[PDB]
């Protein structure tokens, strides 16, 4: 799946959101939702919905 990088220290506002800190790499991205995609952190392997606007897609 697509991948993305974090641009802001995101602290998952709703619980089942993902959480990352700037320059954080995200992978295995999916289009679970138009606005919140799902991830997998390449650095730690964490998955969760994230507000695509808090991150930039590397694809």
């Amino acid at each position: 799946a697509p991948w993305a990088t974090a641009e802001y220290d995101y602290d998952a506002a709703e619980d089942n959101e993902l959480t990352f800190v700037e320059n954080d790499k995200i992978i295995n991205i999916e289009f679970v939702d138009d606005d919140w995609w799902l991830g997998e952190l390449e650095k730690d392997g964490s998955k969760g919905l994230f507000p695509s606007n808090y991150v930039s897609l590397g694809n």
Partner: peptide
């Protein structure tokens, strides 16, 4: 806390715990 991060926009209500 952070000072410079977008506001996590709405969330499709079908993607919440439980």
């Amino acid at each position: 806390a952070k000072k410079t991060k977008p506001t996590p926009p709405p969330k499709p209500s079908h993607l919440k715990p439980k």
